[PDB]
Amino acid sequence: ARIGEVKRETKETNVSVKINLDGHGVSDSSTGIPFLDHMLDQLASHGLFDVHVRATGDTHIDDHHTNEDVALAIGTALLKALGERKGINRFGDFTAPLDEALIHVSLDLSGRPYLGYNLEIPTQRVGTYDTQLVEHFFQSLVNTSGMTLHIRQLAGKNSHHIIEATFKAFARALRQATESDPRR
Amino acid sequence: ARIGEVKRETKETNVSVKINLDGHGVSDSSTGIPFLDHMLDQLASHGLFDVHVRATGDTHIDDHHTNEDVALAIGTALLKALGERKGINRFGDFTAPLDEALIHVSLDLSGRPYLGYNLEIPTQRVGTYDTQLVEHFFQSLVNTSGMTLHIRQLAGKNSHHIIEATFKAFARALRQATESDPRR
Amino acid sequence: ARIGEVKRETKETNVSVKINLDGHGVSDSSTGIPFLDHMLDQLASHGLFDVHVRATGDTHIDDHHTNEDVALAIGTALLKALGERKGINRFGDFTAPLDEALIHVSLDLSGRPYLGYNLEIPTQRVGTYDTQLVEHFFQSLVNTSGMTLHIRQLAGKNSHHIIEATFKAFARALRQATESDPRR
Amino acid sequence: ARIGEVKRETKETNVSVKINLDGHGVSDSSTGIPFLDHMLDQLASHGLFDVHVRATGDTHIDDHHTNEDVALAIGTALLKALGERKGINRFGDFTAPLDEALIHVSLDLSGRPYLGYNLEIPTQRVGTYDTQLVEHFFQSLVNTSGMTLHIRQLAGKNSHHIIEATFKAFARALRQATESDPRR
Amino acid sequence: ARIGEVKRETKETNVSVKINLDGHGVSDSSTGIPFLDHMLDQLASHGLFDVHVRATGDTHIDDHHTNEDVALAIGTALLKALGERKGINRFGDFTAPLDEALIHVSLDLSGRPYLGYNLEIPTQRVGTYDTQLVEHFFQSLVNTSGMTLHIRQLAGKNSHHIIEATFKAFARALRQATESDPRR
Amino acid sequence: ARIGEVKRETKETNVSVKINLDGHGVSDSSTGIPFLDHMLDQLASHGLFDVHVRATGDTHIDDHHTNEDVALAIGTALLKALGERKGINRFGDFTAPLDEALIHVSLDLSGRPYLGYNLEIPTQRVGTYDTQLVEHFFQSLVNTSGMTLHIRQLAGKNSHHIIEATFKAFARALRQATESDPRR
Numbered sequence A, B, C, D, E, F: 001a002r003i004g005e006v007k008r009e010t011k012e013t014n015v016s017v018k019i020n021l022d023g024h025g026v027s028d029s030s031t032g033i034p035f036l037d038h039m040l041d042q043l044a045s046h047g048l049f050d051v052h053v054r055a056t057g058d059t060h061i062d063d064h065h066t067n068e069d070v071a072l073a074i075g076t077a078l079l080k081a082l083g084e085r086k087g088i089n090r091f092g093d094f095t096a097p098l099d100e101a102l103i104h105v106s107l108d109l110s111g112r113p114y115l116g117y118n119l120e121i122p123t124q125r126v127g128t129y130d131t132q133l134v135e136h137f138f139q140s141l142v143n144t145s146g147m148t149l150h151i152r153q154l155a156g157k158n159s160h161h162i163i164e165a166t167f168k169a170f171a172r173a174l175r176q177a178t179e180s181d182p183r184r
């Protein structure tokens, strides 16, 4: 099994991540941001990744630093887990709904960071989670993983549905990309 | 094999449906609506479903009641055939052409009915079939199956091509969703 | 292995093509048009086709006749390699990025030629290659192969990225379409 | 005399075509689509082709499959009749009226299929014939004959006049293209 | 030779017309309207018709009645000359320039009168000739000959050029239509 | 046979032209501009002219002077070959396609130079040939031949197709104009 682990401490946050690319969907995420924990559970269940995350940090300032540092660490953990990338599909492409929401994700484990993102989340807070932080989560993850990632909102009105459908589609695309190509 | 069967009688229609999710594309549909029979044949052949349908009803009023009651029964038959949904992909996503027509279908066997539909069929009758009835077929099927279904017209000009490409894409997406996930 | 071979001589060009549908990505293309050679290498590597091409011709007039005659011959070679089409997926659908570029390709090995193409390539020359020739390459290939092909630009700014992403997506869609359907 | 004959059977249609390029306008067409029979009579009379067509098929679904399969077979019959194309004009260009309708047709027996078509037929049914099927007739004929064909509506309001003028102009252009060039 | 002759007297005009369809371009027209005489000379020379016209009438009121009655008589003379129409092309199509002017004429000797006319003559008088009378000349000729006639201005700025190019194109189209079809 | 020959030397260019109006399509053109050579070959083959051209000149400055001086000399050669114009059609009118391109040419060998030209060539270079030079070629040819020439782009997207279709249509119109009128 391909397992990547990262521990990172700043003056703002303390983060530990462990991801198994060849998992069974074991979800074990506690970031101090409940909505992000919910999305990381989606990542595990829809991607069949095992996801272990612990974070503490300066959430009294806002969720930003924690969200960013968790994302950065996940990207690095993914990079480590991938190793030499031998024999993998490398590309993933999936479009997933959640009720009225429909989100397309296309990615390439390319070594060149890029985020294309056009979500229009119509409310500012989902629970206590600042919806600007969704883009920053994916941007930071891309930057440390060296992923080419396109996220396209095809439909959606409920903010929780839009974000959750994004994580479902991303997880399924990433599962595809990380799985073995039977002809390689 | 996962087989669902439904018999339903109203004062307007008499309907019998049997669907095998694990079929070989056996097509055996006679609804009293020839264009709908043609589309149900597409469902079987493109989905590798075995599809048996018989309907009679008040087509002298219009095809509406028959079309609706057939769709409702198909949705219920699908629901029955699925049973506990164990180990299935659950999600399907396919884009199929028919010449100049190009139709994207994304679905989730979620238990929550939703239809997203944006087809713009530029003629009122294909053969003797009222083209408004395409949307109603999918809406009714969604309602009894508890499916999340998005149908997106990406291209198309000929009405028969648009509708037929929709059924090809839907069938292929539904095949995917109903098939076993090798890691589940 | 399914191998198609075509030799074609005009007063303008001399072309030889050999394609293995069941290949390992062996790339061996020399057309007299370096950018086209680069794209044919992408076809091989991303499609797992073995691609052997030799062409000479009137490139001092412009690359047009060579580009066209190579494309025509590739389409015929594909047609020959496919034979009776027994047991194949027939349909392919893939969306691939290259950095900021994102290209969707959907195809059906239908026997009816059709090209849907909406690329907007913002420069006139990539290297010494006239970017109008990309459309003509796909049109000519479609015409002799009898393929239904839709190419959709979803994002992109760099001309080389747009064209190369197109070839990646086309190759992956064509691989899918030509591969065996495990239930057929 | 240059005679081409085609017999083609599908699960949808049974078609037989025989065309003499060097005819006297003998019209003998029975397709199961009366309006199409009327247009094929125009082809014979205005083109001085001898045209023999028989078709049966699934017209209870709609006229589409019959219309398409007849057109495909006519294109192949034309291709066969043309043989090596020695000494022919190859190009045809004619503009014909029918009362207020005025239709320009330009064609080249090039070996490269292309349809340019801009008819705007303002009603959905002429008799029982779906007017979308006019474009599909010419597209399918082009595809199997390998013809470059441009059809331009210059004037017209009555749907029957527009379609019939198209067939008159096409027939006269095709007569020209297929006739001997006295200097070749 | 096919010769038609008409004499017609009203309280406004006295008209005599003789036209030979199989002529040598003999021009012999004196209508009392010099510009119309010039156009009738063009008809003869460009059409290879022999044209004999004499008219007198109420030109002190305006040229209208003479222009109309001459046109009516020419249409009848053409009708008479045509006789049974056996073996003729029947259709004519020609586009002729005169310097910057370019005029397309398409006609069918159909037995159903129709004029399609879109000339935009930018001055009110050419010499002493009222330029509204050009349309009325063709309308009246169509009405008595039973001709389908389309006149299309493709280019032009000088009024004399526009009108004269119209007569050149009409004459050449009419020559074609009235000539023998070698296969009929 | 009607043969015109012109030799012309400037400080910029050396040009020799010989054209046979009553030719067999013998193509023998070497101008120092490969794309122009290709178009002159089209002139010969589509017009059944014999075309002999030799030019050298200052192509390191740009192709302009050579293109212009070749065109001027061709116009003069045509003028010389025509002689007294006895018995010729004088007018030509043809519309030719090349795939998606469709070009109408109408001309009159009038003795009055005029070019009407509306081509919109969407790229700046076809091969190494500056596409502005197409208009200048026809303008210069018109000026020395004393031709009335209208060139109308009816359709087209590929620059090579647009230009080549223009030369096909021009050649066929010029063949018509230069041929004998059987009634003159």
Ligand SMILES: [Cl-]
Pocket: none
């Ligand atoms: Cl899309």
Ligand SMILES: [Cl-]
Pocket: none
């Ligand atoms: Cl036009």
Ligand SMILES: [Mn+2]
Pocket: A064, A068, A136
């Ligand atoms: Mn930040």
Ligand SMILES: [Mn+2]
Pocket: A038, A160, A164
């Ligand atoms: Mn949720």
Ligand SMILES: [Mn+2]
Pocket: B064, B068, B136
């Ligand atoms: Mn209803």
Ligand SMILES: [Mn+2]
Pocket: B038, B160, B164, D065
């Ligand atoms: Mn069908």
Ligand SMILES: [Mn+2]
Pocket: C064, C068, C136, F099, F161
């Ligand atoms: Mn080409």
Ligand SMILES: [Mn+2]
Pocket: C038, C160, C164
């Ligand atoms: Mn590259």
Ligand SMILES: [Mn+2]
Pocket: B099, B161, D064, D068, D136
């Ligand atoms: Mn069709």
Ligand SMILES: [Mn+2]
Pocket: D038, D160, D164
């Ligand atoms: Mn009719």
Ligand SMILES: [Mn+2]
Pocket: E064, E068, E136
């Ligand atoms: Mn009046």
Ligand SMILES: [Mn+2]
Pocket: E038, E160, E164
């Ligand atoms: Mn004049």
Ligand SMILES: [Mn+2]
Pocket: F064, F068, F136
């Ligand atoms: Mn100049």
Ligand SMILES: [Mn+2]
Pocket: C065, F038, F160, F164
């Ligand atoms: Mn060429």
